[PDB]
Each structure stands twice: as C-alpha cells, then as structure tokens.
Amino acid sequence: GPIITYHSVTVRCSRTFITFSDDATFEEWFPQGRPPKVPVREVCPVTHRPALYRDPVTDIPYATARAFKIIREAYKKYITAH
Amino acid sequence: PLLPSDTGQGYRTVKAKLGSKKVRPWKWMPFTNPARKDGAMFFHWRRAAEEGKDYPFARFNKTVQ
Amino acid sequence: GLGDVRYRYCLTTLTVPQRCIGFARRRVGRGGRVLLDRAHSDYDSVFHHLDLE
Amino acid sequence: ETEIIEGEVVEIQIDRPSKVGKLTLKTTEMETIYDLGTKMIESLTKDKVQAGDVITIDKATGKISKLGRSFTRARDAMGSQTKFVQCPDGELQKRKEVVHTVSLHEIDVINSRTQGFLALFSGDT
Amino acid sequence: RIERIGAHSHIRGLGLDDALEPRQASQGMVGQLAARRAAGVVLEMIREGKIAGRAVLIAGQPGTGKTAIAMGMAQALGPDTPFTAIAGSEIFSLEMSKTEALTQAFRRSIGVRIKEETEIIEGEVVEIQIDRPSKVGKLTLKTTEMETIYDLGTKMIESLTKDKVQAGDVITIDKATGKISKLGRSFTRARDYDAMGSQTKFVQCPDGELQKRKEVVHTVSLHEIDVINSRTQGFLALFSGDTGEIKSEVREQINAKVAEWREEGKAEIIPGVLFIDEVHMLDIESFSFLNRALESDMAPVLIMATNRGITRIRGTSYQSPHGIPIDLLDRLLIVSTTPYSEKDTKQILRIRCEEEDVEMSEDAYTVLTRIGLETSLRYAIQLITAASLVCRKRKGTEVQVDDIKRVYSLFLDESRSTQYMKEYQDAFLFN
Amino acid sequence: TQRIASHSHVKGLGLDESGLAKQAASGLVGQENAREACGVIVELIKSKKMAGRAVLLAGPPGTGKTALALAIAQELGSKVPFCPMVGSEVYSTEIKKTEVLMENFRRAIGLRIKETKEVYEGEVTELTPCETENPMGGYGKTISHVIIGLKTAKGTKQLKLDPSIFESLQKERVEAGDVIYIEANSGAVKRQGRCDTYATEFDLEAEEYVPLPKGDVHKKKEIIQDVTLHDLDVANARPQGGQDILSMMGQLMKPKKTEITDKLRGEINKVVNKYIDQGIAELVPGVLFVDEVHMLDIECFTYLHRALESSIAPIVIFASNRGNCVIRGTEDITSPHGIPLDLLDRVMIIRTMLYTPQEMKQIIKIRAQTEGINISEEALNHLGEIGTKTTLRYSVQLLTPANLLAKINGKDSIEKEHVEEISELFYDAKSSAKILA
C-alpha cells in the first residue's frame, strides 16, 4: 500500500525525512507541473476598448448591442462570402 | 549607475491592436532649411504625411546686434 | 552647496519592482524617449535606510 | 448601488467533468456565453432551473435569484402554478441604486441575534 | 498585579502569639485585644475541626474593623481550607428560592479532597518511525540513567500523530489514559534544522526509571459535585450559574456516596468556613431555614456581622437585639468591639501611612489623629491619600499640617455636610 | 454635525497648571472649589495607586453635576474608559440587582492586550523537494526537506521547508497560482485564493480571487486591542461553538443573561494576572458615575459596602439633589439624600452652591455662542431677569425658539419683544403652578 517513512532521526540535533513508496506515489503525491499561465487581455473591436459582453459564438468581446448587431452583420457576410 | 530605458513589449501578450492600426509610413524625403539662405536641399525621415511643413527647428534665428 | 544647476538628484522607488532606487532623475532621450538616470553618490552602496534615521 | 446581471438563459450544457456553462443569457437584443463554476452548477441544479428561462444572477454572490421562464411560451404558453416572465432587454449587466429607511430599533434587533427579524415580526424580543 | 491597594490590604493576619496573646502590633493589626483572643480561639477550634454546626456573631460600633477582623481571620486560615464570604442582600434572587441559595452557599463552603494513584512514563523522544500503509510504528525513549525501545500502539499512533511531536523531545505518557503531554524541549530536540522553524529554550533530561506510578490528589466542593452530576451535562452551567432547584434526592444520594467513599480512605473531607455580612438583611424565612441548617453534619462554621441594636425584625414589626430572633440568638455566642483609644489611633494611622508609602510630619500626625478621633477614623483614612496628592502637587515631599487643613476644607465631611444642608434646608427636595 | 446637546458646550475643566481654576475655561463658571476638587480627583485617577474610593456630589435641583462629571471625563480623555449610569437601570426583570451592580463594576475595568506575530506571505511560485538517499537502508527515494518558491508583490524567494510540512500543505489546497499564510514560528498555512492576475483577463469569474500580497514576506507585526473584562467574562463564560448542536439549541431559545458565578471571576483574575505579569496585556482601570443614587434601595447600598471594600473595585462617583428623605425600601428611615449613614461614612463628599445672576449672564452668553446665535443686549438683560425669577434651564430653552421666530421675522438677532412673546407663550414653575392653582 502507501508506504511512508516518518522516521524522525533526532541526532545532538533533530532531523526527519520522508521516503515515499515508489515513483507512482511520489508523482501522485508530488505531481506539480507547468506554471499558472496568466491569460492575455482582450478588447472590443468596433469600439476599440474592452467589453464585458462577448459574442456567444465567436466570443468577440462586443460592447454595445449595436456593436453586436454590426459584428453579426460582418460575420454572416464573411461566411456568405466564405 | 546605469539607466533603464522604456520597454513596450514586456511579454508576448499583444496579439491585437495592430491590425486596426496601420503603421504610418516614413520616407527619406528631401527638404530645405530656411536658416540656410541658399536653402540647401537635405533629407528627413518624415512620416510621409508630414510633407511640406516648414523646417520646424530653424526658428532659433536670434543673433547679436 | 557645490552649486550644480543640472545635477539635482533625488530618491524614489519604482512602481512594479518598488525599492529604493537611489538618487535618480528622469531625462529625455533620442526618439523622444524619457530615461531614468540613477546617480552614484557618497551613499551609493547603502541605499536602504528608510525612516530618516 | 447594486450593479447586478440578469437576462434569459437560452440553455446550459451540463458541465460534465469542466465548468463551461453555456451562459446564453440572451436578452431581447443580445447574447453571450461564459464559464460556470461548480458552485454555480450546483446552484442551477438545486434550484432546478430550466433552459430558456429568465433569471437574474447576483454579480458577486452569484445567487440564482429564481424568476421563472421566458416568453417563448407566452407573450407555447404553458400554464401552471409557477410564475411566468418574458425576456428582458439589452445589457445583461446593469446598475440599480436603491435606498432604505430604518429606525435604530431595526438595526438593534437585526444585529441582536441570529434571527432578530422574526423576533420583530413576532415582537417578542 | 490585578489587585490594588485596598482598605483592608494592610491586614495580613491576627498578630497572636502561640499562647494566643495578641501582640500590640503584628502582620498589620492591633486593638480589640479581647476580640483578638476570641478570634484566636475560633481559629484554633477550626483547625481542630472535630465539631460541626457552631455559630458566632460579631457586634459593635460601625466602622470598627469587624470586616477587618474577618479578613485577618481568612488570611491566617490559609488557602487549603475552603472559605467564602457573601452579603445578605445577595441571596435574594429571581432565579431560585432563598432556601436553595442558602443550601448552595453551605455546600460551596465545604470541600472534598480526592486521592488516587497514578501510572506514567516520561523521557526523551530518542527516535520514532511511523509506517503509514493500518500504521505500524516503532519508537524508543531514554533518560539520564538508561534507555529503552518500544512498539507503538495504533491509538498511540493516532494520539502522537495528532500531537505531531518531534523526535528528540521530552514528553510523558500515561498508559491507562494514553494521553501525552510535552514537558519542554531538549538540546537535540530544539536543535532543529537549518530551516528556521522557530526558536525555543531547553529543559533537563528526565531522571529515574521511565515508569514512576506516583499519586495525584485533587479537591472539589460539594456543590460542584451536585451541579456536575445533576443535569447530566449541567456541567457548563457551573460557570453560567443557571443551576435551579437542585433536587433533594440528589442531595441525599451524594451524601450517602460521599460518606461511604469517606470512611474507606478514598478521600478526606474538610470543614470549610462561611461568612455572611450584613446578616440583618435576612428576613424571617431565612432565619427559620438556617436555624435548622446547622444540624446537618455538613455544617461549616458560620460567622455573622451586624451593629444594630433592638431593630425591627426584617419582614415584620418586631424589635429584637440586632434584629435577629431569639431562637437563633440562643444558638450562638457573641463578641463585642469597643471604640478605639487615642494612641492606638496613632499606631493605626502610622501603619496605613506605611501601607501608602508616604511619610510626613509629626504635627500632621497629631492634628490628623485628633481630627479623626473627633469625626471618625474613616474620614482620616480618606484624608491620608488626598493629603499625599496635594503635597506632591506642591512638588515637595513632607506633607504639612497647612496642607492637611487645605484638603480638609476642600472636602467637607458628614457633620459639615449636614451642617451645610442646615445652612439651606430648602436646597434639596423631600426634607 | 450633532444637534446641540444639553452639555455639548463644555469642553474641559480648564484648571490652571498649578491646579487652580481659571474663572472661565471651555464652558465653566463659578464653583471654583468644585473644579479644584475635580482636579484632585483626576490626579488621583492618574495616580492609579488607590482603589475602590468613591465620592458623592450634593447639589440642588438643576443637576449641573452632569457637566462636572462630563468635564472630568473629558480631561481624563479617551485613554481611560468611563461609563454612565441611571438608577432605574438597576430595576431589571432578568437578573438580580446585585448581579447588575457587580456587572457594571466589572465593565468599568478596561485592558489592553499587546501580542506580536510573524508570518510569511506571497504567491506559490514553485515547489520542490531536497531528495537524498542518505537515510538508512531502503531505496533512497527520500526527501531531506522541501523547497518552496514564494512571491510577494515585493519580490520572490524560496525557503527551506521540513519534510513534514509537505503533508500539511497537501491538507490545504495548495496549487500554483494562489497565496498562503505561512506562520513562521508555528507553521500554520492556509489558502486564500488564486492570484487575482488570472481573474484579470477573466470575462466571468464567479470565484473571489484574492489579490497579490504586498511587502516583505517576513512580517505580521504586533496586534493590539482593548476590551472591558466584562466582555471577556461574557465570551468565556458561555462557550460559543456556533456549529455544535448546542448552538442550534441556543438559537432555538431566546438568548438571555445568567447570573455569572464568582469562580469564573476569580479565574479571570488569575489568568489576567498571568498575562499581565508576562507583559502581554495592560490594564487601564476606569471610573464610574451613577446618578440619582437616591433612587436605589437598601439592598443595593448594603451590597455596595461589600463591593467598595474590594481591592479591585474601580473608582466611582455619584450625585443626588435629595434632602434628608425617607430611604426607599425603608418604611421610615430618613437620611441625607436617602443614603444610609454607614454608607455615607465611608465615602467622600463635595457640594455645589447656588449661582449668582451675573454667572447666569455669563453662562447664557456661552450658550448663545455655542448655538452660534447672535443676541441683542436687551434680550440678554430680559432673559437674565427671567432666569432670576425662573430656573436656569427654563431661560436656556427659550434660545432656539426665539432665534427661529426671529428668522421668521427676517431678523438675525433676538430682541426684547421676541423674548416677550416667548415668555407669554410658555410658563415657569411658579406661573405654571398658579395657573394650575
């Protein structure tokens, strides 16, 4: 099973250490890996500054409802073209 | 005792803001200095659009009397 | 007391990496770029006292 | 000032573990999508919310303030005990400044104990 | 330090020699030599503790140290013996009947001492190893004489791992309880790592064999036992004091069990002492109830104080000596206190000045003593520190009689206050 | 700021440095001997040597003594607590009288707890072990100790962490991108929340990201607070344990007050002595003021004997304007201010006198300044006459209604006629009695 060594060697001085069962136990026990990677900023295209609201499909951060309508216009136009 | 300089990049975090913003071009355009009476024709790396503007830097024509 | 008009320097810290910067002054540079020039004076090595000991 | 969000969710995908809720809070004008925290998922489940419903979401708390369903049925119309609502409009996020008035007695009683409010209603403090 | 110089801080005992002759000055006391004799006899008999139910009253002029006598008694008694002082007005409560309150006070006064053997070990945490998978454990300890190594119990494992003790530490464990206690870290224990962790002092390695048996003794009051076992989780009410109408069957059951524990060397009882002030504040009901409250064997000696004379019985219209019905009066004896003399007053005031640590002029002593004699001792006691403050404001040290007159003028006294009220009777309403 | 109160004008006893009384200072007049006596009392309080002493003020109706006690407290400042009291408070339907008295005495003693602390903060940057096979026997897959890379807004660093603490931090939800409360000397650790930086780009973030800690990691500075040991008694007497079944049970019942046993008090005394002698805490004994002491009964006076005798009782003061009346509770017993002779014997006393009309003019001027209302002199003399016949407060109340009437007139200063209509509008003690008669 999970074999752990809490053998606290007091040697004069105090000392303790841990010996995990195996590499699997060490990894699940100490997996870590890769940093948080804070994301990047984004802004609304048409009004050229960030928008709380964002397209439900393409996720474009559209600010105004009219911004939404015009971006939908441009979208459907692009797809119709290609 | 050094001097830090302005940094604009910092990190690869600026994908956007450029496609909407054209880089205003610069040209090695000729020009003339009023302070040179003969008006010797020299050159500037002006941003294209800033063409024909009087030599802005020759306004220091103060002298003894 | 030496009387150097342009060599007036002052202490401050920075925004993001805040810390005692040492006697420093801003100054314009080529391409219209401002640059901070940090001086080197009698207390150069000891630029951390704080509280005006 | 409150500055809370609301709208009408077109639908939500069950966040199979993946807190990506299809926050299609389509107002009469607009729509978007978002994430959906585990607390949010359990809130939606416990409140037994339905897709194509009009609900308002507390900004900071995220409390799913139940409000019923959307006009998609009635100005189909499904008649029952539950209240029915149409779709709101425009900005899901909006601001709303509110005022209140209370004598010092109300504050005293409310902060007196856990449930001073029912003490007031019963007047037995 | 929480204490502060109190009116009765100067008292430290009774100042009685071995033959109980009072000494003209001792542990802050002098005067009423007959009273000191009687009090010494009372304290001796309390030490004897061979009899129950005795009661005694102290009467005299007001402000004549009756409380001081009682406090000297309590001090000389010692902390081992239980003691308790209460005021007559305090029994009157809106939570319980008065009789229950009197029973509670009585049972509080008496105490019980429990003796019981122990079984414990203690030593350095020489080494430990725990082997989470249940958990297998191995451990050793030692002392300044030898060393040993033992296995580790599963419940011992949980106990220690919750304790999170560090190897090299010094601790003690009881086998029966299996509860550990850290008794201070050791040289190797707190030598710690390179990593900071913390800093701490050290303790000397234990000695003798690990196992030590040893005996422990405790003490508790009868009322405490009553309350703790009364409601079955009435324990927390001990502090809240919300105990109500502790039933009588409980009283008798506790009495039986405590008696049987007693005669079998299990524990030893101790007859406490209970003092009630302003005893005249009791009504006739309390007099009736306590009149019989003395027959029960668990009867700590009672001490009462009151200065009245031929006063209406509380709750009725009957004048009686000190307002206590004769039925009680014949059940107890009395002690009287006389008003103090001249020179003794000088001694008392010098003692109080020593208490205050403020040393001043001789003429001041004479004048202040005469003034206090004429007016009262208590006003002189008040004037002591006031004069001290005034003189310190003068920025000198020796208080001068002129300063005494200044302060006396500043703070009118009782006689001056009534004389003033006379100066304008209509000043204050309801005259 | 505040609608003017009956004593807002006063601001300080204003005794000269030598202790003598400036004739007028921060709203005071006359009673110079009383002011000097109050100076002596504040000196005694600041001394802190004494304990359990108390005074009583004897003054005619129209208390005033309110002002004296308030000025005493103001000179005392806020460095030391102080609590008021009214005789009717003793009559309570939840606890016995002596309980209320002892409780109010207890609440009058303050304290100041000084406790230092240290912790390490930041955002978890990385985490690594110090592997070593040195340990005896077995596959040497062992960790000597852990290395934790922590970052505050000040900067970043890492520290040596013993093997045991990795298990702890497992216990908490330690993950890259969050901050933690690492007790340096104790080893306590917690998980506030993920670094706000990630939420920054988040379009929706239901969670509540904790911000990034600022400043050095190695600091938690010294914590400080003050309380009245009565609050300590309340907290300790009834354990809180708001989660336990017993907590639900308590909230079922209406919370109330219980007569706190004295053993809890003695134990509080012991523990506070232990803390103080170590220098952790600091006691700031206060003083107490109980007005209309005459409203009490005999029970409370007799108990006050015992309470005063104690060597822990904070200083206390009283006031009464009652003559040699029959003592409440007592059917017949009469004594000055209805205070038993024995209690009177072991207390100090100060007295106040009547006030001359010039003093009335001075005080009225002060009050007009306080309200910030200009006054024409004829009004001053007329109201001086009114107060001469009437009491002081009667004359004082007429200020604001008259000022207002003048505002209605468009005027600014009050004049003789204004006070004339005000006088006819309202009646004094004698005029009101006659009209009643």
Ligand SMILES: Nc1ncnc2c1ncn2[C@@H]1O[C@H](COP(=O)(O)OP(=O)(O)O)[C@@H](O)[C@H]1O
């Ligand atoms: N002979 C004495 N020696 C020392 N102190 C005394 C003596 N007589 C009285 N005192 C002081 O004066 C006080 C007298 O008060 P006391 O008469 O005991 O009050 P009560 O009348 O309520 O019992 C005591 O507290 C004590 O401090």
Ligand SMILES: Nc1ncnc2c1ncn2[C@@H]1O[C@H](COP(=O)(O)OP(=O)(O)O)[C@@H](O)[C@H]1O
């Ligand atoms: N009973 C009194 N005895 C002495 N002076 C008084 C009395 N009442 C008021 N004064 C004086 O009146 C001034 C203001 O006190 P005031 O606020 O009227 O107190 P209160 O409203 O309680 O009468 C004070 O300067 C005080 O000197």
